[PDB]
Symmetry: D2
Subunit: 332 residues, 4 copies
């Protein structure tokens, strides 16, 4: 599939990188009114957390040339004015974080785009999580959402645990690496006061609808999950801490077994499994949506257990956006 | 009561700092075979996380003089060889971390010390948590433990929640600040492989018996609590994340009501309460053992909730060591 | 003197904090379109790096009440609209960082303000550095600049070294703490690309005109100094690294003696002096503009030396803004 | 050439990694009487700063098998006892940081090894810096030193600048990333009080003989260089800040010209050159010994300049240890 990407931020750049490192889709256009061609070369080439881009990045003839492939560049604030159709872009990845509504994201279709994938939760667009409910997608859906990075980490795990033991209720906490929405020093945040406090100095409590969203991709869990988060001073990689009450008795060993089996089969590449003495950095640039940490979790009894799963909030999610588009194309 | 302190590390120094700013407890002797008199002046005077000491510190005639009070300095590696008696130390704070058992801490009694307070969990010494079970102490106890910093944060909260609603079962996680036990860069730790990884770069999973210990200071909770921890790159101040099942239905507001009332009454100074948009640094040098964060927590339903409480793992605990000694002296 | 402050950011808030601590000036008005009254209470009360404000802060009948004194709050986006005169503000501290020109800062005059102090370098407004050239100010100056935090650290030191030994030429490097202008993760920064890279992960080279500016407050040094900077992942406190060649031979002990005498006399409170084994945190909330670190520096020979001086980039500078206004008032 | 490595710390592991990542040499033995075979697999496989090993690491029959190549493991505490001879270890990399002297390091020769390379400065062993004085090595030298990481960064640059313009005198400052020698929180380090202070919280001044050592690999510069360092909270990658006086007038562009040609010719792979807007992370895992940052430096005049050069203190140096051995082998 030929793809267009709106917004060249962390998500836009990593989705583009994933498209190229994996070769699964072909990026032929990028739109960003604030980042010009030459700056794009720089931002895509050098990455503090994921390293310098493996391949080539040059600006040739007004176009961004990555690994030899020329990419048309646009500078439109209003997506409706982006000529995706002329660039040959069939699918458009909406990653600005500003057009997450069915209506706003629809603006891309007015330029030639056949379909739009919102790289963020949507209030009305149907949300999908690879490995959990992506087969519920059909050709009538012109605008879809790939949910959030945290939802993509919890949903795969929640599905396995619920199918095998039945989740009566659960509460999650995600210890999250600092994000771009945060501030370097105590600054104005207006909406969320705690988010304005110095990121590198604090452990910051924050709200998140990721746990509740899992009830949307896994209907049986609707109303049985919710949680919150703590933003901590690490550049990348976060972890889900799921405390849940199980319906059927489950020894910790059986939980490991069931998850391991899932990571080697139906959820391979999506849900990972490890028993090694890992730490956050061991998952930097890891493409999994969620990686179960056997040794980190702990059970109180056969019905009350705390499960731990890692996720490169940047890389994993970006790869799922590409995997979602591949699945969609196979349904055309 | 005249006090002696063994080990001049973070706790030894902060307990001494807490003592001098307090009043009724006097430090008259300090032992540390690794830190010489002049180095002690430096380490006690300058503190990266708590600021320069407010008062005077000097090296005079071989003694450490703080705020004018001369302190006898010892350099024994064997606690059995410390002459606490000659120096006048009735109570000895055992804070090295390598003499936590009854059999080892008793050594201080050879030099004349009358009672020994272990500033850490003990495998056999009776453990106490101010505000929770300190009333259980009696004059026959010559060696006691003040438990851990994390246990001192969870116990006060657990007591209030259990007294009013009944904790059926709970699982905690403590997002914990960096400790002197970790390494600056990936280094050796043959016992706990994960703790050897770069502290500033990672979110590090770790085991902790703090939750299980609460079942020791609150017998009714024995076997109903356990948890683990995540070490993150912040210099000080940690937070307890308690997910528990309640027996009696409890609206979040009722929980707020009850906790707040406890902090203004029986647990004043021990358990704090706030509804402000706080972050970890707001508890820097806070002397509370635990401070309930009303806005950070969240409930799934009237019987399943996640409670959040802050604690300056260094300052709070150090002040409780002093408070424990004051209580003991009042029972002599 | 009745003072008004525009912009309630790190400096606006710290200048206000500095003002209340010592009744040198009375803040009677504040303006900031991005921070409403209630948010101001929060931002001023809680400070990650300098601690909770010691005193009281509340929102009463539409005014910000600090330590009892009620403060008129304005929310004008345009400086000209701000009715400084009405509220009773003689001097106005221009700390937004956007109106640093003579032309722009003059707008405060159109509102009733008598004098205007720009808390940042100015392209045309006369710049002053307490202890170095503040004696050059006169009643005809309605708009002045207090230079930069780095210039205030280097100038005092440069003056003493030049007065006694003569600086033939010098090059400085300032290892700087992070500022509100940096990003938490690799993000866009059109004018300064390096400044867009993750602040907590990198040592970031940056340009600075602070060294060249010293030639402006000390005319004899015009064209004899320049330098650059390295932004590093520390919340606050920076250090100047001055490498200079001397005209008159100077043993290192002579440099120490000369700096020590200056800090105890004419530059007391401005230029500090220490021989202790200090690190950056030992200067947190230190009100000096520059503190000479005797043990940190090193000389190659009697004419080529490297001098080290610390400065709390936030606190020191904020106090100098207040000291500058006090001096101005004494000249009215 | 077959190699043995004594010490499996940061240096030992990265030298081993470099050996396989290049294939210039072949590691056949590792001696570390403090790290168990299974722990070695873990420490070599997972690396916080350089990522998971891009290969294979098992533990087949008492040996460490990397990329399908078996390595004999030793737990000998006295180098003399190691059987380098039987294993086929022609050269031994002494990287413990303990056996640095000509005699302590000599302990390896008895074990059957032909030559010993000390991965650290030596008080009496001849020191070499690839690209600067490695041609001075001859077959009579059984024990050699590869100097320090900082010396390997400054020497290449100093050689080029001195060769073309003549360095009259210079003073350097190295802004250094966090090292193992440091402590996570204020701890004991009696020799150097400042090195014991919390690494993640401070900018720590430290002494370094790297600048003076350049006078030993470049004799003409003996006594013309010295400097110091600042430890900052970054995991890896450091930068040299060289302020020097030139004999021959040199415009900044002439310096760029000369350094660039040197990086494309005689010093290719050793001295790098860039004009891009780089930051520390852009040099993570960079194998150069030193990379000139054109845009970061600044000149006061044609005879006084500040030159900036980056170096991955871990990776660059480790690769030079391998390059030194390759050169030695070619002289056999
Ligand atoms: N700081 C915290 O977060 C905290 C709070 C709860 C409990 N604790 C407990 O406090 C104890 C120490 O922690 P800390 O942070 O002060 O550690 P440090 O900061 O490790 O302090 C320990 C001190 O013990 C001294 N020491 C070592 N061996 C000795 C010996 N043989 N004789 C005499 N002195 C000796 C050291 O020189 C050092 O100054 C541990 O048992 C720990 O579990 C720590
Ligand atoms: N913190 C330092 O290191 C430091 C010390 C020396 C000088 N300075 C100078 O101080 C100034 C501000 O720096 P800071 O760190 O406090 O920044 P912030 O921390 O960016 O503070 C600026 C404040 O200005 C307000 N503001 C923005 N637009 C405005 C408008 N149109 N009208 C009124 N208020 C507006 C913001 O809401 C914000 O609170 C800059 O010019 C900077 O160069 C900084």
């Amino acid at each position: 599939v030929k793809v267009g990407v709106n917004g060249f931020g962390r998500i836009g750049r990593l989705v583009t990188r994933a498209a190229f490192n994996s070769g699964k889709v072909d990026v032929v256009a990028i739109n960003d009114p604030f980042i010009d061609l030459h700056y794009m070369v720089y931002m895509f080439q050098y990455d503090s957390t994921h390293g310098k881009f493996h391949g080539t990045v040059k600006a040739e003839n007004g176009k961004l040339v990555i690994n030899g492939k020329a990419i048309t560049i646009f500078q439109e604030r209003d997506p409706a004015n982006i000529k995706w159709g002329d660039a040959g872009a069939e699918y458009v990845v909406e990653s600005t974080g500003v057009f997450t509504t069915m209506e706003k994201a629809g603006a891309h279709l007015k330029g030639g785009a056949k379909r739009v994938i919102i790289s963020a939760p949507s209030a009305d667009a149907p949300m999908f999580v690879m490995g959990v409910n992506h087969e519920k997608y059909d050709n009538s859906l012109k605008i879809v959402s790939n949910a959030s990075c945290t939802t993509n980490c919890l949903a795969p795990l929640a599905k396995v645990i619920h199918d095998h033991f039945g989740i009566v209720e659960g509460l999650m906490t995600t210890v999250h690496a600092i994000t771009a929405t945060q501030k370097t020093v105590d600054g104005p945040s207006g909406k969320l006061w705690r988010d304005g406090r110095g990121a590198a100095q604090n452990i910051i409590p924050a709200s998140t609808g990721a746990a509740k969203a899992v009830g949307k991709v896994i209907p049986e869990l609707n109303g049985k999950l919710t949680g919150m988060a703590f933003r901590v001073p690490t550049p990348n990689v976060s972890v889900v801490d799921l405390t849940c009450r199980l319906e059927k008795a489950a020894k910790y060993d059986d939980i490991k077994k069931v998850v391991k089996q899932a990571s080697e089969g139906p959820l391979k590449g999506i849900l990972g499994y490890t028993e090694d003495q890992v730490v956050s950095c061991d998952f930097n640039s890891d493409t999994h949506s969620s990686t179960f940490d056997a040794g980190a979790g702990i059970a109180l009894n056969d019905h009350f257990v705390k499960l731990i799963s890692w996720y490169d909030n940047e890389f994993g999610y970006s790869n799922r956006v590409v995997d979602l588009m591949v699945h969609m194309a196979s349904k055309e």
